[PDB]
Design a protein around this ligand. Structure first.
Ligand code: HEM
Ligand SMILES: [Cl-]
Length: 393
């Protein structure tokens, strides 16, 4: 009843060009079995959305990577938010929601926007830049560590640590095992910065620690919730902003529409998140035998969700393979869906909006002028290098 496929969604061949294989996965059926890793897969929007929105049946506390925490030891202490189910999930989630809330966004927006405008002005003086290192990486590095309240020393560990986290959700392939082999210095740095005395007043980290007396979290939970933001909040935005720049370089008609109405900046970024889905995949584990899209899945089984595929499923989207900055993107799953839906989405959108606004107001053309290089990661999609020439407006 369930078709078996040999596609390896964690192979470099897949990362290099996932879209044909994702159509094969969607068209094979609502539920597939991936013999390569002995997991179920769902690649259509309908089933991905259904799985995300039934956390009781498709739980996260046994890991959202391939590894089943009931069978293997986690490579690090489990996340108190990502790798927790209700009810344990609920109060830590509420704390991070209030830390990364609308009020916090109002406090940081002006500085995030000034930093984006200044970066674009700087890049325009250079003309020919690498939109990854010099923009997608440089801009979040110029705002997010400071907003966290991190000291200056040691920030070179942040991107390696995040790459490690997202590789570690994958299977035990060379990407994962190499990342884990080199991880000790990055974990040591990150875990240390999660302690209250190392987080500057008023930053996201100090705000988490300041929530440890309401009855929602205890002081011993705060370091791991800081760890969540340092795991999830930098590399994702790098790939999201890089995706948006890549899209504007490949779809010049859409750059021209954005220039003509810079208030499209926020939707242009959201559409980039749908179109390139920086977080491509992750898992749930079934807590019982369940029927999904006509197929029966046993208890204790890993289910791989293809978020990027769901965001390109023609059963849900018109012209899914077009980048359209006026698309109604509501319902895309690039930030997830349901109780775990990205708690940092307002930070992500703020960064992407103010960067695309700066581009819309200051740049007339973005032309690829060098070899484009992909960055390979078990669960993130993004570029390693994006050489562009920026023409000033
Ligand atoms: C374009 C940027 C981003 C993308 C594409 C993204 C994507 C996602 C997705 C798909 C999930 C759901 C995971 C699941 O259901 O298992 C998620 C959760 C989460 N994200 Fe993001 N994210 C982004 C930015 C951020 C930022 C900026 C932060 C923090 C400042 C952050 C922190 C978190 C946390 C803590 C969770 C766990 C939430 C929970 O389990 O309740 N993310 N993200
Ligand atoms: Cl760690």
């Amino acid at each position: 009843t369930i078709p078996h496929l040999a596609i390896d969604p964690f192979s470099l061949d897949f990362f290099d060009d996932p879209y044909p294989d994702q159509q094969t996965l969607r068209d094979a059926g609502p539920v597939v079995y991936l013999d390569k890793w002995n997991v179920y897969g769902v690649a259509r929007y309908a089933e991905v959305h259904a799985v995300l929105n039934d956390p009781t049946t498709f739980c996260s506390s046994r890991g959202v990577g391939l590894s089943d925490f009931k069978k293997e030891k986690p490579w690090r202490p489990p996340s108190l938010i990502l790798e927790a189910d209700p009810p344990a999930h609920t109060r830590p989630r509420a704390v991070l929601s209030k830390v990364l809330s609308p009020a916090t966004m109002k406090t940081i927006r002006d500085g995030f926007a000034a930093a984006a405008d200044a970066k674009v002005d700087e890049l325009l003086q250079r003309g020919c830049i690498d939109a990854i290192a010099d923009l997608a990486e440089a801009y979040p590095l110029s705002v997010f560590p400071d907003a966290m309240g991190l000291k200056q020393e040691g920030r070179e560990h942040l991107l390696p640590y995040a790459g490690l986290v997202f590789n570690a959700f994958g299977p035990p392939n060379e990407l994962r095992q190499t990342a884990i082999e080199r991880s000790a210095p990055h974990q040591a740095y990150v875990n240390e910065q999660c302690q209250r005395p190392n987080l500057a007043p008023g930053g996201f980290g100090a705000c988490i620690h300041a929530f440890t007396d309401t009855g929602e979290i205890t002081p011993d939970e705060a370091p791991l919730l800081v760890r969540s933001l340092l795991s999830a909040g930098l590399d994702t935005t790098v790939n999201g902003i890089g995706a948006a720049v890549y899209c504007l370089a490949r779809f010049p008609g859409e750059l021209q529409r954005l220039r003509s109405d810079p208030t499209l900046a926020r939707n242009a970024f959201e559409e980039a998140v749908r179109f390139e889905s920086p977080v491509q995949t992750f898992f749930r584990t079934t807590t019982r035998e369940v029927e999904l899209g006509g197929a029966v899945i046993g208890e204790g089984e890993k289910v791989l969700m293809f978020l990027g595929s769901a965001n390109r499923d023609p059963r849900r989207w018109s012209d899914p393979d077009l980048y359209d900055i006026t698309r109604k993107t509501s319902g895309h799953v690039g930030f997830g869906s349901g109780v775990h839906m990205c708690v940092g989405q307002l930070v992500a959108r703020l960064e992407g909006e103010v960067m695309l606004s700066a581009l819309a107001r200051k740049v007339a053309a973005i032309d690829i002028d060098g070899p484009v290089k992909r960055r390979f990661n078990n669960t993130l999609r993004g570029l390693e290098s994006l050489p562009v020439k920026l023409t000033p407006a």
